[PDB]
Amino acid sequence: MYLSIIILPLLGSVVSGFFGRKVGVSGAQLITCSSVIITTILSIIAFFEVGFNNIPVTINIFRWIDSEWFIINWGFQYDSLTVSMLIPVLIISSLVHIYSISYMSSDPHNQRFFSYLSLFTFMMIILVTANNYLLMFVGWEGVGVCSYLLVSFWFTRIAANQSSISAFLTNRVGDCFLTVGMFAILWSLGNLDYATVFSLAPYINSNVVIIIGICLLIGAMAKSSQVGLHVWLPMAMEGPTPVSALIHAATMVTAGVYLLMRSSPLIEYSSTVLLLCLWLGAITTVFSSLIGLFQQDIKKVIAYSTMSQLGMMVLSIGLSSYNIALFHLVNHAFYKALLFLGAGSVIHAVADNQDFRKFGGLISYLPLTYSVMLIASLSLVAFPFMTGFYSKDFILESAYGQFSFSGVAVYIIATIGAIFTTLYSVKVLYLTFLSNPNGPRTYYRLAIDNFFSAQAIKSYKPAHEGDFFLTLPLVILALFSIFFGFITKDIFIGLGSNFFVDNSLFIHPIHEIMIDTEFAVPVLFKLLPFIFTISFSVIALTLSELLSELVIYFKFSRFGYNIFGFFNQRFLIEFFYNKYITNLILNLGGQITKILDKGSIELFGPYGLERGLVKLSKNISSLSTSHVTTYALYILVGFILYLIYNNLLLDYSYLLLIIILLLLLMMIGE
Amino acid sequence: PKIPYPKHVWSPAGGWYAQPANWKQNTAIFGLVIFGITAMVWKYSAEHEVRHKMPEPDRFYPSRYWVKQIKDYERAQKEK
């Protein structure tokens, strides 16, 4: 069974993509969705078997690379971590598969589409089910190619093309550091099977832990978009929304998070990497939450929410608390999926518009869609007693529980990021739903008012909600975003939970903060985010639809104008990327291939030797005037010089220099 | 509406709005293949699933009926 949940998603995709001609659009959907659904059902069984009963299972099909000490197998290991990883991956992938049945009945190429999402599902199981780092890299690069293939799904979009390049190229930038890190693992241990790296890790050199740990830290940044390796994610949203839900909200961008958790037995023996895991997590936590506030696209705003929750995931990794990271991980996935899926039905309601400047009302038009997005946002903002409450809030107490300077320092950074989390959370809810209409008439012109004489049959299209296939995933995630947090709180968080007892997530007693997270923290700090959440929201409710003047006054001030533009344009980071990184590469290539290759390399080489040797030989041909007296004088001169060379006992260097001098005055014309 | 497109362009994934009249029996024909090699995988998986901790008989355990590493153990334990 355990090897079956690897094969099925692969099998649907090849029939969908290579025989999609012979199964048709609806057949491609039925095959792949069922394959995902079947894989979903067995995944939850493995969670009940691998984790609850504490039996990890090993599959070793055959060898992949076999060179001396290096025996990498196509082998698969299920343990407590990978069954937990496979729950959000498989629940959401199925729902997104159903969500796309409604989503893309108008898109022509609909069965190339359904194969990519089932090919994405296959490689995410490969990533998490591996025995070793190298096989993980197959699911690693495999989701990266699946993402490129989906970002540029509308490949006649030039925008999708540049976005696909950015996603593909940026993830390679991290994959270099990941690959170099695995070279350090192979060098210092002789293999990279997980059982072998972690058993030996408590004895290896400290400095090899940092060098290995650092390399996988950069690799985590590219997949899990961080403060530097993120430019690929916000414009990865050029793909269809089903893609962004499964891949760019909940699954692919936590690959780096999963790597940090999986490697916890290894990285736990060097506080340095955990220190950067902490500070980088808060810096990216606040860097992202600020950006989304000033975004005039619902897809691009909710994209930036993904990075912010991702940022808090890395923070807990640096907290040496991976159980919280996994708990928050899965919990963030469920509601965040709904947030994009809720937005997706919104985009279908309007004529595929994405700007907030022409969104409003829609309360009566999209009642169900509003209800779910509120449910998701409340768990996103960590409203108390929700799915996201236990997962998102516990972090801050865990951050504050570690009574160190860094822990308290990022508590402020996380909290101010949480403050801005509220701001865009209501901004999406307000502008789209709780505000005056800002689009054209057709978005809201119902049939209750006649307003038409001969066009009563058509022209209404007043932004109705979707059908069953579009709404069913919304309802399913809605239940999880309410209750799933409380049900599994002891499963992952607990206080002395023995769920992770097969050394799946290793934690060292020297930096335990679990007891301090619940006891030593003052009560005010425990409920402080709740105070800020309920408070800072009403100011936004006060600043819009109640006053709607202070925000305009702040905009047009010279100090306020630039702060809007600076944060809108993503801290000018891509500006500093395109001009001074990639345009630099494109000009070094220009210098090399013009000045050097088709340049000096040829001139100080074939073309130069060609040009001068032709001239040198025309000159020596010039002496061949075919007149007998000139020829006799040439013979007598050579007769003289051979006598000079011999009986004078000249050093041979003069003769060489005389010849070079003659050859190179023969080179000189006239 | 429907985007116009060439009718000569053979695609392996189908083309623009591809669906054959026989999208069902062909789907059934392919569906048997997926099932056929899935249990084929399940057989090999059930034969190579190696474990080290044995489950309690009381606990719910779906794999007690197909896997080998514990079915032999369970009947071996049924000897006293």
């Binding site: 048709g24 659009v25 | 709005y17 591809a18």
Partner: peptide, 6 residues
């Protein structure tokens, strides 16, 4: 609708 594959 769904066009016949060609």
């Amino acid at each position: 609708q769904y066009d016949p594959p060609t």
